[PDB]
Write a protein that binds this ligand. Structure first.
Ligand SMILES: CCCCn1nnc2ccc(C(=O)c3c[nH]n(C)c3=O)c(C)c2c1=O
Ligand SMILES: CCCCn1nnc2ccc(C(=O)c3c[nH]n(C)c3=O)c(C)c2c1=O
Ligand SMILES: [Co+2]
Ligand SMILES: [Co+2]
Lengths: 382, 382
């Protein structure tokens, strides 16, 4: 059941912003590891004396990496005279965020019809304001409210390429990498208490709970009207045999924050081949592969969706498969993106729910907690 | 003239330590960009609750990348009970260093006969102590004194692989990259006043001035007894037509610090081919190439050392050439390694001074300031 209760018009995920200590090195690592092209920049070379910001793109996926310069470079500026291209940026906030959390997502940005309206309605409905609406070059409006922890939900609306003040990156520095990733599918937060987090976010957005179908977590998914903006939230389950990975996150992250970004691939086999080739040469590592029992068990549950060759191709790449009543999903998880056991990435591809594909087709793979446990048990038995 | 006045026995450069905000992403970027293998680690997986440290190696070159975890993970520890593998590490110091300077070199480490003796003699001779000698697993001794800015000179001595508490990296995560880099040739600091910096460092080491043969800087080189540890220092020259790059460094770095690391290649043409292939896919960018006039002028000055083909190979790769009275050097400079216009890398290869090669063979390329100016002037004339 989808009551379509959005309190303002939401379009799609727009971008994800990481707050970094050095944006250059993180952006270069991510570019190579994920096959994203350098698309835009705002930094000293573009007149920004406040922050260095680099934009990577793959299809419609936009990853922004931002780090502060020395405050001394902009010490004469005031907000009316700022050279920052992202007016919500604050040196102190960014250094505090990174010192507290390490590398992670500061902003989950969604495109809306009217960012000022979205902000006003959100705050009138309980959202904690973070940065008021600001109009950039009479062309783009940006505003921010708190989502969870030190993560903000950023509203972007365009009158009519990324943001004013960003320059397109010259093609000589813009190598056209592409491993198949095309858009952000969902963005997941970890919180200490799921109930109040859901009540807060659903309260100010009107996002509705997205329907699904004893290992670590409780979770629920908030969704926009057309269910293309998907925001799952987890809480830990305490007093368990194996310690909750949600609790480990909260400890190493110093509290709530973004847990994982799920990136949709138009060809998950090509994406995983390309990413796995680069794991040990600057790219990203993946979770340990499930035992062959898991892939033996795949025939009985998805043998009508995937051929045997496609199933053995899943086995070569360590891909996981789950299934809804409407669709099937292929997914895999990276090891943490930085030093701390906190944020990671999921690669996903969905099969089914054609009309275009409806959002969330196949669910989020929660059936894979069960199947991974069973498959590991069966494999020890050999 | 080399008076061989070292006040303690110095062997060779041992390692360079970068203080990072996220050691993982910087180390992965550097590994791919420079062709260095992941060799050792000290982090949560090895029992270190204090800092994440990753060691890259190429030949004898050792680059260490370190970042702090949340202090909460080690809040119960005291120095006697620390899980840090580098006892000089301090959360507050590291966060202050990185917030002040951005990504950069914290420690220039040299291997000595006896680190405790080196420390005592250094401090008795004016060195400002930074971390007292500490013996690790009765096997290695480490101590630190201030060098310039927030950079320390680190003494390491071994009784008899990197440091106790570091684990060798498993070969599955250790891809054997190698683009030809073999050792650290020199490490260069920028300071506001060269005179007092030289007096200080030469005062506590006994390092002697290394002999050489109107654009931005004054500099001098301090050298160990066999001139294998080479520490140049620059100061700005003010009131010039083009603003001093040394002054720009000091402004963006918030003061004195390490300017460039010069990495010796056993085959600079292979190194530059491999690095340039990767510039736009996660690696390092290089300075703009000199005009063809520079390479036309190369025949008249090094035509007896390099063939025409080797000279056109320099031209394809943007390599610079200078010459002493004893040797010739090939060199090239990267663009800055991170967000700020501060630290960069030089790749170098030296020809001549065989006996083994004596240190500093060919000088440091200061003749290239002159030749670059002339070559740019001649090229505008066409
Ligand atoms: C070695 C680590 C593997 C451990 N594991 N095994 N099976 C999983 C199935 C689905 C999801 C996931 O992505 C979501 C769950 N619920 N929602 C809303 C989601 O997005 C994750 C993260 C895992 C997951 O980590
Ligand atoms: C576009 C930027 C090119 C500008 N430039 N042109 N010619 C150079 C020649 C030598 C050295 C160098 O490495 C040292 C000088 N003195 N000492 C002791 C050194 O190590 C450098 C850094 C340059 C240098 O930057
Ligand atoms: Co997911
Ligand atoms: Co040099």
């Amino acid at each position: 059941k989808n009551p379509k209760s959005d309190k303002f018009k939401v379009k799609r995920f727009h971008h994800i912003e990481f707050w970094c200590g050095d944006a250059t090195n993180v952006a270069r690592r991510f570019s190579w590891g994920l096959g994203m092209r350098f698309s835009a920049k705002s930094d000293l070379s573009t007149g920004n004396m406040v922050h260095a910001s680099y934009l990577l793109t793959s299809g419609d996926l936009r990853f922004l990496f931002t780090a502060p310069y020395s405050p001394s470079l902009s010490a004469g500026e005031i907000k009316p005279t700022t050279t920052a291209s992202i007016p919500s940026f604050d040196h102190g906030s960014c250094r505090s965020f990174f010192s507290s959390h390490g590398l992670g997502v500061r902003a989950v940005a969604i495109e809306v019809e009217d960012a000022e309206s979205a902000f006003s309605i959100s705050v009138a409905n309980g959202a904690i304001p973070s940065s008021p609406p600001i109009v950039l070059n009479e062309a783009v409006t940006i505003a921010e409210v708190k989502l969870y922890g030190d993560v903000v939900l950023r509203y972007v609306s365009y009158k009519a390429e990324f943001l004013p003040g960003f320059e397109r990156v010259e093609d000589a520095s813009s190598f056209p990498l592409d491993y198949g990733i095309r858009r952000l599918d969902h963005a997941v937060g970890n919180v200490p208490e799921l109930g109040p987090a859901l009540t807060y976010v659903a309260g100010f957005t009107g996002f509705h709970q997205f329907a699904e179908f004893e290992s670590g977590l409780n979770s629920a998914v908030l969704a926009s009207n057309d269910e293309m903006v998907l925001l799952p939230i987890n809480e830990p389950v305490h007093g368990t045999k194996r310690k909750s990975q949600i609790q480990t996150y909260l400890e190493h992250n110093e509290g709530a924050g973004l847990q994982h970004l799920a990136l949709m691939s138009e060809d998950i086999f090509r994406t995983l081949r390309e990413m796995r080739k680069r794991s040990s040469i600057g790219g990203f590592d993946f979770m340990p592969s499930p035992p062959p029992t898991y892939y033996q068990n795949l025939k009985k549950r998805v043998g009508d969706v995937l051929s045997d060759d496609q199933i053995k191709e899943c086995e070569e790449l360590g891909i996981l498969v789950d299934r809804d009543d409407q669709g099937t999903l292929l997914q895999i998880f990276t090891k943490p993106l930085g030093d701390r056991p906190t944020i990671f990435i999921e690669i996903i591809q969905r099969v089914g729910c054609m009309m275009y594909q409806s959002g969330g087709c196949g669910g989020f793979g929660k059936g894979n907690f069960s199947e991974l446990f069973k498959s590991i048990e069966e494999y020890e038995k050999t």
